[PDB]
From Swiss-Prot, chain A:
Entry-annotated residues carrying N5-methylglutamine: 90
Induction behaviour: Transcribed during late G1 and S-phase, repressed in G2.
A GO BP annotation: DNA repair
One term of GO molecular function: DNA binding
Superkingdom in the source lineage: Eukaryota
PTM section of the record: Phosphorylated to form H2AS128ph (gamma-H2A) in response to DNA double-strand breaks (DSBs) generated by exogenous genotoxic agents and by stalled replication forks. Phosphorylation is dependent on the DNA damage checkpoint kinases MEC1/ATR and TEL1/ATM, spreads on either side of a detected DSB site and may mark the surrounding chromatin for recruitment of proteins required for DNA damage signaling and repair. N-acetylated by NAT4.
GO cellular component annotations of the record: nucleosome; nucleus
Residues of the whole record sequence present: 17 to 118 of 132
UniProt name for this protein: Histone H2A.1
Function according to Swiss-Prot or TrEMBL: Core component of nucleosome which plays a central role in DNA double strand break (DSB) repair. Nucleosomes wrap and compact DNA into chromatin, limiting DNA accessibility to the cellular machineries which require DNA as a template. Histones thereby play a central role in transcription regulation, DNA repair, DNA replication and chromosomal stability. DNA accessibility is regulated via a complex set of post-translational modifications of histones, also called histone code, and nucleosome remodeling.
Modification N6-succinyllysine occurs at: 6
UniProtKB/Swiss-Prot annotation, chains B, C:
Note from the entry: Present with 524000 molecules/cell in log phase SD medium.
Portion held of the full protein: 25 to 103 of 103
Resulting phenotype, residue 68 to E: Mimics glutarylation; delays in cell proliferation; increased sensitivity to DNA damaging agents
Annotated source species: Saccharomyces cerevisiae (strain ATCC 204508 / S288c)
Modified residue annotations for N6-succinyllysine: 8, 54
Stated name of the protein: Histone H4
N6-acetyllysine found at: 56
From Swiss-Prot, chain E:
Record keywords, A-Z: Centromere, Chromosome, DNA-binding, Nucleosome core, Nucleus, Ubl conjugation
Protein name: Histone H3-like centromeric protein CSE4
Keyword Transcription regulation among UniProt keywords: no
Organism in which the protein naturally occurs: Saccharomyces cerevisiae (strain ATCC 204508 / S288c)
Similarity annotation: Belongs to the histone H3 family.
A Gene Ontology cellular-component term: 2-micrometer circle DNA
Source species taxonomy: Eukaryota, Fungi, Dikarya, Ascomycota, Saccharomycotina
Phenotypic consequence of residue 98 to T: In CSE4-102; impairs nuclear division by disrupting the core centromere structure
Keyword Transmembrane tagged: no
Swiss-Prot record, chain F:
GO BP term (any one): regulation of DNA-templated transcription
Gene that this sequence comes from: HTB2
Cross-link (Glycyl lysine isopeptide (Lys-Gly) (interchain with G-Cter in ubiquitin)): 88
Modified residues (N6,N6-dimethyllysine): 2
Origin: domain of life: Eukaryota
Descriptive protein name: Histone H2B.2
Functional summary from the UniProt entry: Core component of nucleosome. Nucleosomes wrap and compact DNA into chromatin, limiting DNA accessibility to the cellular machineries which require DNA as a template. Histones thereby play a central role in transcription regulation, DNA repair, DNA replication and chromosomal stability. DNA accessibility is regulated via a complex set of post-translational modifications of histones, also called histone code, and nucleosome remodeling.
Localization, UniProt: Nucleus; Chromosome
Family as reported in the entry's similarity comment: Belongs to the histone H2B family.
GO molecular function, one term: structural constituent of chromatin
Other known facts: Present with 443000 molecules/cell in log phase SD medium.
PTMs per UniProt: Monoubiquitinated by the RAD6/UBC2-BRE1 complex to form H2BK123ub1. H2BK123ub1 gives a specific tag for epigenetic transcriptional activation and is also prerequisite for H3K4me and H3K79me formation. H2BK123ub1 also modulates the formation of double-strand breaks during meiosis and is a prerequisite for DNA-damage checkpoint activation. Deubiquitination is performed by UBP8 in presence of SGF11.
Amino acid sequence: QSRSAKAGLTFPVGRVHRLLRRGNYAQRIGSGAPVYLTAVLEYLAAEILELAGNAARDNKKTRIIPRHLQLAIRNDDELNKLLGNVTIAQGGVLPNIHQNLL
Amino acid sequence: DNIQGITKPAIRRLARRGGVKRISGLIYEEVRAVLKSFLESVIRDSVTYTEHAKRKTVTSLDVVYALKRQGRTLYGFGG
Amino acid sequence: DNIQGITKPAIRRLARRGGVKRISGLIYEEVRAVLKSFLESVIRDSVTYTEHAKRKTVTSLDVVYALKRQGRTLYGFGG
Amino acid sequence: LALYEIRKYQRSTDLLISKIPFARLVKEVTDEFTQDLRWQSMAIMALQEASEAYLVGLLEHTNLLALHAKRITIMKKDMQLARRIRG
Amino acid sequence: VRQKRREKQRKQSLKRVEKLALYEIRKYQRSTDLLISKIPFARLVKEVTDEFTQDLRWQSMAIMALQEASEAYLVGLLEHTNLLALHAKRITIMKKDMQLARRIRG
Amino acid sequence: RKETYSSYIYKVLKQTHPDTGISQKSMSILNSFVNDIFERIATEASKLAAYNKKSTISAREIQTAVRLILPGELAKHAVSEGTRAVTKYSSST
DNA sequence: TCGAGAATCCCGGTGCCGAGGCCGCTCAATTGGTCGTAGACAGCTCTAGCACCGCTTAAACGCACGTACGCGCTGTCCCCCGCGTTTTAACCGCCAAGGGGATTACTCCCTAGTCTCCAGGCAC
């Protein structure tokens, strides 16, 4: 019985606890810690995959491309607060012609 | 010369990606100079990474670590 | 009422300290607005720090660590 | 008398903005965000210094933005595009 | 040489089928791929690495990531200088416009 | 043979929206993003642990780190998901 | 005018390379008895912020000369730009050498743990 099947988790909570142990970060890791790490990573993954599913829905393509992920990460102010500095490979840029040139 | 390999219509298409109506003839040399400066500023760290590692291949892991060190992190090539 | 804790000649003398001579009338209200939006994140991060410290008084080391996390490191108040 | 105050406030390397109205302002924002919290005066003067540095950086960024648009008096749009290169 | 025959067939298919500046702005804003010619950029980064080198090798994906990051930084600086250009009542940009954004960022 | 989240990303994709396909480069971008936010929350949790005399990383350290990094709606939904999963874990051992 | 025959629009068949699934598997995930060690609470003090105001006190609020210049209009003037035309090297395919990356590990060498003796270091 793994620690993931004790809470319905899918992200590898035992592996994550192992990388926190043998990963030059801290000394002790509580039992309530890596299930919560698995929880917040699962929430972030569910948010970005739902945004990618919407981006695949409204763009009539049944697959996930990096342009869809770039339009996911750049058209949300919470995602511009979180990851407004990093970029996506082959993601392109935001199509926004300014009003003064129009 | 290899600094003029990125020619005038290349920077024109880059500006049309960035949304410019009309551009001037003084832009291209300063664009190439700031591109050489940014390339030097990332390549110095990216080659000190591969010079410490007893290697001669500038690996993609080394350039994404050097990009993460200098703020502008990429996704997909490690990390 | 503490939203007007700063005054207009104070912003004028701060502009003379920097180099801004001619000031518009909207600049003081926009400075109050950008001060409002600037202090709020660091102060609520210090509230999160004090909640991590589970006390009432906000200690100075929590302020230094909050300004270090925000990217506005201050020298002289810790270490 | 234009160069008088520029050579006065810059050479005097002390603070210029208030302390106790800033204490009232930080009490106001902790009443907005938190429950009253006691505040060390070193933390209040550290917030004062950080606000001063952020403001002088914003004004020294808009200084050349004023002369860029053939102006001298800074405008409200100057505190709308200097934030674009400040995050 | 079946790969050569397939390449000639694809080249023939591209030659037969695939073969007021306001359109290019909205055209190149929805493009996703790279826009810098590859092997002159590789020769340029080979010349840049010759200043800080020894026969240092190069993986191809590293030069691809470098081209992507440099294109991203250039379009970021260009998108930031367009606002300062139109702020100074200039539809046409100038080298003075790419001096303040190169100054106030650091 | 590297410990990759790829099968887990496809698994959590197949629960809410199974109609969308996933490529290779986009999946590697997702894996690098989740590893980046994982190491960011790891170093922030280790930093907050080494701040105020608590070497054991409990749920308190990482909930303070989640409240620290994320914006308000994101930290609210993240602390909701984390409290839900920690009750489901501490209840079912 | 009938009809047979050639051309084309639209409908049906088929490569094809990327997404999806799968058998074999093999160093990690689980649980466990234990065990030195973090750590949470509490008397108790001590110490830093808060209010009132004694006593002054520069400084902001706001209105009045006045002229510098932001915005808009008018004329100027020229420099990138669309377009045509000529050149040119990028991409692709392919032949070829070979060179560092990757994987295995052993003596040796440098470190965790151990106790023992001494010279730093802010307080009086």
